[PDB]
Amino acid sequence: KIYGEYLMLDKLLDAQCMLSEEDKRPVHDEHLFIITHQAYELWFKQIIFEFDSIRDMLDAEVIDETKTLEIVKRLNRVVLILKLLVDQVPILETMTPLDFMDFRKYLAPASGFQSLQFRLIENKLGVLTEQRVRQKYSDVFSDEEARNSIRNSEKDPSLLELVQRWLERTPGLEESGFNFWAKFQESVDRFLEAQVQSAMEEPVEKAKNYRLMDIEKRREVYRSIFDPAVHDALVRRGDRRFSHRALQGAIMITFYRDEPRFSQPHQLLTLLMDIDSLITKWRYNHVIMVQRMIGSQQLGTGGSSGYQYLRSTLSDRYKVFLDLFNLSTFLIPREAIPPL
Amino acid sequence: KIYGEYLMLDKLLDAQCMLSEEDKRPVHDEHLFIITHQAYELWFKQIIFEFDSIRDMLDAEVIDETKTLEIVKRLNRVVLILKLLVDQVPILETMTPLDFMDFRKYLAPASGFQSLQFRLIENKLGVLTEQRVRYNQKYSDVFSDEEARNSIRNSEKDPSLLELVQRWLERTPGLEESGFNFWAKFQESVDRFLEAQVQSAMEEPVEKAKNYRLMDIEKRREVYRSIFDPAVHDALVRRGDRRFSHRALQGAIMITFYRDEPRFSQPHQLLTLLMDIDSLITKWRYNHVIMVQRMIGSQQLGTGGSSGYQYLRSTLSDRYKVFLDLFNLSTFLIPREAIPPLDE
Amino acid sequence: KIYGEYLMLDKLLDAQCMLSEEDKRPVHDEHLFIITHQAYELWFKQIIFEFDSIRDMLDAEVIDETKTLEIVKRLNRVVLILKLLVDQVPILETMTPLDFMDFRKYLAPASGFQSLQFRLIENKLGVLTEQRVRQKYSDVFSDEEARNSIRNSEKDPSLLELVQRWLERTPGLEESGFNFWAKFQESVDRFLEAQVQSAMEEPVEKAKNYRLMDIEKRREVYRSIFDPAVHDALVRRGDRRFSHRALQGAIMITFYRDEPRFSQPHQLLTLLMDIDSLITKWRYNHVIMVQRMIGSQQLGTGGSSGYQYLRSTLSDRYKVFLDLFNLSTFLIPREAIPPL
Amino acid sequence: KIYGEYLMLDKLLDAQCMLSEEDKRPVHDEHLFIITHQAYELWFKQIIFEFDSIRDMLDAEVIDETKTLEIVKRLNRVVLILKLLVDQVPILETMTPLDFMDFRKYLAPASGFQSLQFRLIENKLGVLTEQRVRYNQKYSDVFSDEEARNSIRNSEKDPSLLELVQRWLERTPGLEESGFNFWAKFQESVDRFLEAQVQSAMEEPVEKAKNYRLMDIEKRREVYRSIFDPAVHDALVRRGDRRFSHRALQGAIMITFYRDEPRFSQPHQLLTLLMDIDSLITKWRYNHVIMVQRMIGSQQLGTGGSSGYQYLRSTLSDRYKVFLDLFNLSTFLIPREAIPPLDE
Ligand code: HEM
Ligand code: HEM
Ligand code: HEM
Ligand code: HEM
Ligand SMILES: O[C@@H](c1cn(-c2ccccc2)nn1)c1cc(Cl)cc2cncn12
Ligand SMILES: O[C@@H](c1cn(-c2ccccc2)nn1)c1cc(Cl)cc2cncn12
Ligand SMILES: O[C@@H](c1cn(-c2ccccc2)nn1)c1cc(Cl)cc2cncn12
Ligand SMILES: O[C@@H](c1cn(-c2ccccc2)nn1)c1cc(Cl)cc2cncn12
Secondary structure, eight states, X not given: OOHHHHTTHHHXXXXXXXXXXXXXXXXXXXXXXXXXXXXXXXXXXXXXXXXXXXXXXXXXXXXXXXXXXXXXXHHHHHHHHHHHHHHTHHHHTTSOHHHXXXXXXXXXXXXXXXXXXXXXXXXXXXXXXXXXXXXXXXXXXXXXXXXXXXXXXHHSOOHHHHHHHHHHTXXXXXXXXXXXXXHHHHHHHHHHHHHHHHHHTOSSHXXXXXXXXXXXXXXXXXXXXXXXXXXXXXXXXXXXXXXXXXXXXXXXXXHSTTSHHHHHHHHHHHHHHHHHHXXXXXXXXXXXXXXXXXXXXXXXXXXXXXXXXXXHTTSGGGOSXXXXXXXXXXXXXXXXXXXX | OOHHHHTTHHHHTTOOOOHHHHTTOOXXXXXXXXXXXXXXXXXXXHHHHHHHHHHHHXXXXXXXXXXXXXXXXXHHHHHHHHHHHHHTHHHHTTSOHHHHHTTHHHHTTOOGGGOHHHHHHHHHHTOOGGGSOOSSSOGGGGOOSHHHHHHHHHHHHSOOHHHHHHHHHHXXXXXXXXXXXXXXXXXHHHHHHHHHHHHHHHTOSSHXXXXXXXXXXXXXXXXXXXXXXXXXXXXXXXXXXOXXXXXXXXXXXXXXXXXXXXXXXXXXXXXXXXXXXXXXXXXXXXXXXXXXXXXXXXXXXTXXXXXXXXXXXXXXXXXXXXXXXXXXXXXGOOOGGGSOXXXX | OOHHHHTTHHHHTTOOOOHXXXXXXXXXXXXXXXXXXXXXXXXXXXXXXXXXXXXXXXXXXXXXXHHXXXXXXXXXXXXXXXXXXXXXXXXXXXXXHHHHHTTHHHHTTOOGGGOHHHHHHHHHHTOOGGGXXXXXXXXXXXXXXXXXXXXXXXXXXXXXXXXXXXXXXXXXXXXXXXXXXXXXXXXXXXXXXXXXXXXXXXXXXXXXXXXXXHHHHHHHHHHHHHSHHHHHHHHHTTSOOSOHHHHHHHHHHXXXXXXXXXXXXXXXXXXXXXXXXXXXXXXXXHHHHHHHHHOSOOTTSOSSHHHHHHHHTTSGGGOSSHHHHTGGGGOOOGGGSOOO | OOHHHHTTHHHHTTOOOOHHHHTTOOOTHHHHHHHHHHXXXXXXXXXXXXXXXXXXXXXXXOOOHHHHHHHHHHHHHHHHHHHHHHHTHHHHTTSOHHHHHTTHHHHTTOOGGGOHHHHHHHHHHTOOGGGSOOSXXXXXXXXXXXXXXHHHHHHHHSOXXXXXXXXXXXXXXXXXXXXXXXXXXXXXXXXXXXXXXXXHHHTOSSHHHHHHHHHHHHHHHHHHHHHHSHHHHHHHHHTTSOOSOHXXXXXXXXXXXXXXXXXXXXXXXXXXXXXXXXXXXHHHHHHXXXXXXXXXXXXXXXXXXXXHHHHHHHTTSGGGOSSHHHHTGGGGOOOGGGSOOOOO
């Protein structure tokens, strides 16, 4: 009813227990260490809440403009929360390595790997278990409800899977209707044929050859999308994650983004990329903080494996919407884009 | 002693209770409303923790260079936390006024005035109870709990950061009349500097330019009378224009004059961070009023008029600025050539 | 053709002239003072360029969804540029007051009042000359092309005037069509009548009276918008700037913002408010910097009039879209809003 | 000497020439493209100015506390400018790929490689020419102008901030074998500390726990061999893992151990700011590659394949990090109780 009761500050503000204080040798910065983590976990709970609601709205045959606006609003909110979480790292960096050394021994069985909510965010966004650098990540959890939650987050459709189903059903790709993919192939042939005819008229012979070489590079780019087998091979080696039809829809969305009907679906894709990039930015800032606190290896780490694992999470293997970042590779000028 | 147990996530993550969900009409954004406030309250607890530790270090006769560096580190930490809290406002602003309307009726007896930690931060920094804008109810009357009232009473009576910083400034080495005797040398430097300015102003060819400089030199003399005449300083303190004791103000001025000197650089950084904290609390106040206005306007159903909004706008005044004196110290500055040279 | 030539760095990077260096007594921070101002002026030129293009798109009878998206994009860009300009103040604050004192004497005839581009931004956004705290601001400019530019920025329709014409023509306000204003008045009567009937059933008599008192406060709020004469009086005393019909359109936009047809026009209004608030935030950060460099008064200022003028620019007199900030005062719950 | 004349806005504001406008097909966003780059180049000139002044202060036998404070102030200023430059990327990202396509063809001979000031910042900070990733053309070959080539050559041969910081670290008071003799005391402290760790590990009841601790103590001994055996340090320097001389590394380690001490706090802040600058240049590199990829993908018409994109991705490696050694100093830290006590 009143402020403190509505926010349950009785419970919230009685969850801070400094172990160095319990051992009668308090380290002032352990309080900051606890509060920073607790602020991360409150926001992880909010991100999970937003993600689950967006997954429910995406797990439907009909995705109208009203629901699309609501998804864009909540993805944008997650982007703001992730920027705030990236800014929480310089606050914990204000703790000196020597002060952290005076209480890190009490952490002992605790590990960053034991954050159930961080794993739930990764899985709900779409981090594939097979693409993780590897004890299996889920083995760290001994609690049955924690194991159940992890297992459910892996088997339930992730934002990656749901966004792909939505992209596959993009109105415009329909061969009976607008038939975008076929028109796009013809536009590429017409555009590239004109580029070859224009390259021949070049005065300097070195400039004529550079353009003919460049046009061949373009043809190889278009073979990677117009030949389903070349796309499938790229998917197999981890270079792509999207189904061939989801990729077609994402490309069409980027081509018509200035059109009122395609502007919000394009904003939805942009925010997915921003979320992906912000998670990587948190990963990078976290490794820099780990290195400034305890170096690449310290007493208690048993070598540099922990640090090296953290550095390997910065690879494109942990990027969920990897395909979205490369879509501008397939773009042709406005004059060559098939008219709506 | 695993991650979840060490951080007591059993307790921390079971403190979210949506009242709209309890009334069988859940509003999705109520969860954001609760989480945002809980993140503010966790950081308020950290700011209180840092403030209390800084107050203990300042409540001592001996404030060495090692303790000064530690105070500067923790004040800088509070600055970073306050910038983060200012950035939490745009997150809550993603909630639309219509969605907030569907759960604000459950808030009913709850009020932002009931945040004990926010009041504790204000009092521990140094907001005087007499300088608060009041339309009816005293700020402490909002708390019915005896331990909350006791905490508020203790934060008012215990020395604030404002009081403790003043005692530290009064004991500034350099002000000692037996030693460096800064205040007297400063007065002589002002006379020598201003007398030279008058002699230079007389040589001006244009009469309009000669008069502007003589008028400006008189403005300077009035500025220096406000600090060299203790009675003029005392009157400014009485009308709320100043908060510092005359000797604390002398110390603060001396610190700004010699900030480039190794011995005065950390004490100047300590003062700069107090100003930054003051300024950041005002920035949070401004962003909060903008958000309040965009959510419920200047008045809405349930507010009984515009007094809440008008009260929030009045907290943006210099009445709520704690280290008000620090912001105006450059008014008393003279050029490097005129500053009394340090011996050692 | 090459990088330096395309960006005219020959010209751009030969515009830095330290007067303290010319007088054989260089002050290192004068370089920062010049560069900071020059970076402000480059971005002021960009803001003016964006504003003029938005004014051209708004000065048309037909404002379609395609043009609305483009205006929202460029207003958002101006918001990002203004946040960057606010962040340039802490960079100049790194210069100590004593170092600024060693070169401020060379500034002499130069004044912040002589920034033609800052005045052009204020006028193009919509700062009324009559609402300025006052030598007239335009008297500071002796150059004929500068005076012409200022005069043109005052007489040409500002973003404030153009946004109002666009709001007046809002489809939905048409008495022949949707007729929003009349339906809104009826909804307010029905909603408030129900609030009175519900207030009577209250168990505590003190709670019943608070609600009846609150309902009367609501009726006085609605009289300020449903009685054109009360709106006109508020406009006369500077409390409002919008025409009665522009205000009706802005209110309707906020009520239906979740609807696909009203989402971009609402984003346009939100960005106008963000721009207004960011200009005020720059004004506040600028006065704080002025005070930390030269106090409320210093040698050369002839008293505190300069500082006091800067503090008076922080008032609602300099806020252009003042009306937009108070629109939530008129809101009724979703169930009471007239259905589209 | 009015505002516009003092800032030479006649010159500054007549440097914007849209090539799409010259070809009678203007693209509105080309103006943003030019202005953004011109704002970067103004700030690059400021960073170069600050760097050159810091290099002059560091190129001296006597580096007093007054000059150290001034270096810390200007390095902090460069940090703020770099954070602002990182924030200029989202502004240019508001330009759509299709609009950039309508004017990118006019850019033709222009290249980001032709920014002389960006190369000057890299070289003055300390990026070694041998550590650069090269696919064909040397980075300096991109410049046809003799004065540009001369500037690049001078920035490579003149002592960089990396070289100057190392000379300053070598002369660290405390390393002197006649005086405090830190390095030898540190080696003894490591032996005493590790020997006690071995004796404590033997008392463990569980055999698996006793072995983990003995394995960990061996990892520590290998870490200390990498710094106490000059040949192991020299091999790491040869393979690019380290850049510092063995004595510069000793000084940097000593500074981190005593950072809480008044005499070591500003030298530690100097090192922290060098790391922050290094890190912020990498953050700009990352944001720039993301923007390049969102505008023109990994390859587009006119790029002749993906070599440009692939080169930009390779600049994110530790090969381009100048003060690489500073980031790993906490690997050598021992607890406070084991750190050799300072005499004076
Ligand atoms: C004093 C600062 C910190 C240090 C020294 C540190 C250190 C580490 C280390 C060494 C690991 C790998 C596991 C291990 O070997 O123990 C790790 C993982 C992790 N940490 Fe931190 N950490 C710090 C702060 C934080 C903060 C503030 C958070 C936020 C919740 C966090 C979240 C995580 C997460 C979620 C992982 C797993 C990352 C992944 O699997 O990709 N850490 N950390
Ligand atoms: C939906 C957003 C919010 C609205 C509409 C809102 C509204 C208000 C109102 C109207 C008051 C005055 C008391 C009253 O008349 O009820 C107030 C005071 C206050 N609010 Fe908020 N608030 C919001 C978010 C927040 C957040 C996120 C915090 C952070 C903890 C907060 C902290 C406070 C505090 C501490 C006060 C007292 C300020 C002072 O006395 O100077 N509010 N708020
Ligand atoms: C060392 C820092 C600065 C100081 C001490 C300073 C001081 C002042 C003063 C005293 C005035 C009032 C006119 C006068 O009495 O001379 C003023 C006005 C102004 N300054 Fe600054 N200023 C500083 C930096 C800046 C910067 C970085 C900009 C950005 C372009 C700027 C833009 C302006 C503008 C546009 C005005 C007019 C504002 C208005 O009319 O509302 N100033 N400044
Ligand atoms: C529309 C946005 C931009 C695109 C598409 C873009 C693209 C590129 C590409 C492709 C290269 C490699 C050279 C080439 O193959 O042509 C490059 C290099 C470079 N660009 Fe950009 N750029 C953009 C914006 C910027 C901005 C705003 C700056 C700031 C001054 C900048 C600075 C540089 C620099 C200095 C390099 C060399 C980097 C290094 O050698 O590590 N670029 N850019
Ligand atoms: O993984 C652990 C951990 C353990 N050490 C550690 C390092 C050196 C010597 C002793 C101990 N650092 N980190 C960990 C625990 C907790 Cl409670 C939180 C956390 C967030 N990231 C990681 N974390
Ligand atoms: O002061 C209250 C409050 C009550 N209304 C409100 C407004 C309009 C119609 C109904 C209700 N808004 N705010 C308040 C409660 C809580 Cl729980 C938190 C809070 C943080 N700032 C303020 N807060
Ligand atoms: O208005 C002037 C000014 C003049 N003084 C000043 C103050 C004290 C003693 C001597 C001189 N400060 N500011 C001014 C010039 C320039 Cl070039 C730029 C500027 C941006 N804001 C303002 N500015
Ligand atoms: O390197 C060039 C460049 C050329 N293209 C480009 C890409 C695709 C098709 C046509 C052209 N993009 N970038 C470049 C020029 C300029 Cl003026 C500035 C710049 C800052 N980074 C890089 N830049």
